[PDB]
Amino acid sequence: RMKSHFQYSTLENIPKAFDILKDPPKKLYCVGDTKLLDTPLKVAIIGTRRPTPYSKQHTITLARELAKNGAVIVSGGALGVDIIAQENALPKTIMLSPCSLDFIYPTNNHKVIQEIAQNGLILSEYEKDFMPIKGSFLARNRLVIALSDVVIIPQADLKSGSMSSARLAQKYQKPLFVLPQRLNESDGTNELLEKGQAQGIFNIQNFINTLLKDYHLK
């Protein structure tokens, strides 16, 4: 277990976005810039722990360009898509931690997570001495989806964390987007397209510009 040695406090108010939850957190612990919560466009970017170079390249562009234009990238700091997006969105990014803020998880991402604590924002539902179990990740995911205006899943397999979060975006009526992927690659996101549960990002520039326009950043 890795201690963060973060100094952390609590949010004054629970963000109104969490009202759509059945059991919204009544306290949220925080480290970093809470002003990131008062922005017009929050974009969740989540997905596989193992992205292809293709998926990575486009995750980077989305995160970097959206952040450049005042969008805030929301994720869970996981290996793969999450931590790629958040590093490339700094400092405009918010991590929802699956552990309490006195701990780092995952340890491999400690460098970027420390960067997020310093320049972005990390929130946790858990006060102290709390390491994630399976149920913790799932609860954390609801926070990521509820807080975000729109959700992007660049790449995912069927039966993956990203897929339960995709059904949450559907549940919480958040617009869901995926990268185009070849057949028999990224079966999760291709099944989302197939069932019409997600829309494809068939041109990255248009998606970004359209997105920034609808939320009036540009």
Side-chain angles (χ1 to χ4, degrees):
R1 291 185 174 191
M2 178 179 304
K3 302 170 193 163
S4 71
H5 300 108
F6 297 161
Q7 314 275 27
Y8 57 92
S9 178
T10 56
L11 294 184
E12 179 182 8
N13 307 101
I14 307 304
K16 274 266 304 166
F18 292 128
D19 283 346
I20 67 176
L21 296 183
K22 311 257 179 49
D23 296 299
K26 280 149 14 167
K27 272 189 171 79
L28 284 173
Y29 301 92
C30 58
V31 55
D33 180 15
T34 58
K35 296 315 178 289
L36 289 171
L37 291 165
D38 309 321
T39 57
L41 175 55
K42 304 176 184 59
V43 184
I45 306 183
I46 60 172
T48 172
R49 297 146 70 70
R50 284 222 106 180
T52 60
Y54 163 83
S55 295
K56 178 177 179 161
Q57 164 198 339
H58 294 305
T59 296
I60 287 175
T61 299
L62 291 168
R64 178 195 63 208
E65 289 301 314
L66 282 170
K68 191 177 186 303
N69 287 269
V72 180
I73 295 312
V74 178
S75 202
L79 303 176
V81 170
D82 283 22
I83 201 66
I84 295 172
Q86 295 204 260
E87 192 185 3
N88 282 279
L90 286 162
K92 286 226 130 49
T93 191
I94 300 173
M95 173 175 175
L96 279 296
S97 185
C99 62
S100 44
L101 294 179
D102 53 346
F103 283 131
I104 301 289
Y105 190 97
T107 54
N108 287 327
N109 287 348
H110 73 262
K111 170 190 136 226
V112 177
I113 292 175
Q114 288 146 15
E115 294 182 51
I116 303 178
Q118 292 160 0
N119 300 306
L121 172 67
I122 313 178
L123 308 171
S124 181
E125 234 182 329
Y126 314 108
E127 176 178 19
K128 66 194 199 176
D129 292 313
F130 188 103
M131 280 294 268
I133 61 185
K134 158 92 184 151
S136 147
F137 294 111
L138 296 171
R140 180 277 303 271
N141 295 342
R142 98 199 190 281
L143 299 184
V144 167
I145 304 301
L147 182 60
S148 299
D149 298 295
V150 305
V151 179
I152 304 169
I153 306 173
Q155 180 197 327
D157 297 330
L158 298 163
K159 302 311 306 204
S160 57
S162 321
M163 290 306 286
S164 50
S165 296
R167 337 187 196 262
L168 286 176
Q170 171 179 315
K171 189 165 155 153
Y172 300 153
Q173 307 171 19
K174 310 288 185 154
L176 185 60
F177 296 90
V178 300
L179 293 177
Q181 302 276 0
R182 294 180 162 182
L183 292 169
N184 298 310
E185 310 181 357
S186 200
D187 281 358
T189 56
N190 278 346
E191 197 193 277
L192 294 171
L193 289 169
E194 165 72 359
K195 287 178 163 78
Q197 295 163 340
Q199 299 190 325
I201 302 176
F202 300 113
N203 182 290
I204 283 197
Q205 294 300 319
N206 301 345
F207 170 75
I208 284 177
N209 286 321
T210 293
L211 191 51
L212 294 169
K213 178 48 172 174
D214 304 339
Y215 283 85
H216 305 293
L217 273 310
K218 167 200 296 198

